[PDB]
Amino acid sequence: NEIVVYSARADELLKPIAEAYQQKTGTKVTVVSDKAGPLMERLKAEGKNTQADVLITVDGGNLWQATQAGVLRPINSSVLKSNIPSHLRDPKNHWFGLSVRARTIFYNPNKVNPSELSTYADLADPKWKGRLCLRTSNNVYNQSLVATMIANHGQATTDRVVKGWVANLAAAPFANDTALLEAIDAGRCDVGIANTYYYGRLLNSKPQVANNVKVFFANQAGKGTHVNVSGAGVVKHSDNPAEAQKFIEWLSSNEAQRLYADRNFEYPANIQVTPTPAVARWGRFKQDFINVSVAGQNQQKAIMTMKRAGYK
Ligand SMILES: [Fe+3]
């Protein structure tokens, strides 16, 4: 048989995934890749006549958007509920997180002692004036981070924090996380906020970046470090809902988690799968157990928050 996967991941990342599953089960896995928004806009337009069986997309913000658009169908999977922690999957069973990333603090260890660091909020402290760099607010990772900050600390507090962030900027917000991390390495930025897998990707290509850039896991005293996911769900109008579900259940297994998460320097979502050494080297940390669907529920508030704060 054959299944169709609409994927917002890097095309090279799913190619080994499709091959390993065809070798194990004989099922052909066709991958159609596009950006998350356009891909979901495609799935919504195709309706009942769609050829897609599985949607794989990035960030709980987008997974919540796809669920609100009605393009996913809830599935009852004992395998997925056991392999995937509850905070990393949709409460109404429409999607399941399969890799974990952290959005957290990075710093220049030649200029910043980790004892000076603690929380996202404390980055608004005036001691950071002229030392902070951020990636643009026009991005789902930052929308999702601020969405959880609103849920954890309230709207008024978060308004003050993000306004404090902007007042502390050493440079204009960067267009992507890798550019931010490189500007820390260049010495322009002393502290920043980014996704961990870009750091693993950057150290893989330029190992010397570690001299000027280290990771700090934020909010260890409170709720924990913000984590987010890439995840999958069965397309509502799939012609093969049973085989679509079997593929997603396989992705949560040990062997597939290594292929799915390790190659992109992300954490496995399955906690019985130990992270790849390059990732495990950064250390253990407490992660927030807020359900990551809150990243979507509070997305509009986060957008409004960053806009009122002058966070470009
Ligand atoms: Fe990314």
Author numbering: 1 to 312
Authors' account:
Like MhFbpA and Thermus thermophilus FbpA (TtFbpA), McFbpA adopts a typical fold of class III periplasmic iron binding protein with the two globular lobes. Similar to other FbpA structures, McFbpA has two globular α/β domains named the N terminal lobe (Asn1-Trp95 and Val235-Val273) and the C terminal lobe (Tyr107-Ala221 and Thr274-Lys312). Each of the lobes consists of α helices surrounding a twisted mixed β sheet in the center. These two lobes are connected by a pair of antiparallel β strands (Phe96-Phe106 and Gly222-Val234), which acts as a hinge allowing for the adoption of either the open or closed conformation. Isogenic mutants of FbpA and AfeA were constructed, demonstrating that FbpA is essential for the utilization of human Tf and Lf as iron sources and that AfeA does not take up iron from these iron sources.
Our structural studies yielded the structure of M. catarrhalis FbpA in two different forms: an apo open form and an iron-holo open form. Comparisons with other FbpAs indicate that both iron-holo and apo McFbpA in this study are in the open conformation. The tyrosine residues (Tyr141, Tyr197 and Tyr198) are positioned in the same orientation as in other known structures, which classifies McFbpA as a class III iron-binding protein. The Fe–OH distances of Tyr141, Tyr197 and Tyr198 are 2.1 Å, 1.9 Å, and 2.1 Å, respectively. Analysis of electron density typical for metal ions, as illustrated in Fig. 4c, localizes the iron atom in the appropriate position. In the structure of iron-holo open McFbpA, we have determined that there are three tyrosine residues binding to the ferric ion and have confirmed that these residues are essential for the bacteria’s ability to utilize Tf and Lf as an iron source. There is additional electron density around the ferric ion in the structure, but it is indistinct for fitting waters and ligands. We believe that it might be multiple components from the crystallization condition that are non-specifically binding to the ferric ion, resulting in the electron density that is indistinct for any one component. In one of the four FbpA molecules in the holo crystal structure, we determined that two additional ferric ions are occupying the density surrounding the ferric ion bound by the three tyrosines. This might be caused by insufficient washing of the iron-bound protein, allowing for a slight excess amount of unbound ferric ion to remain with the protein.
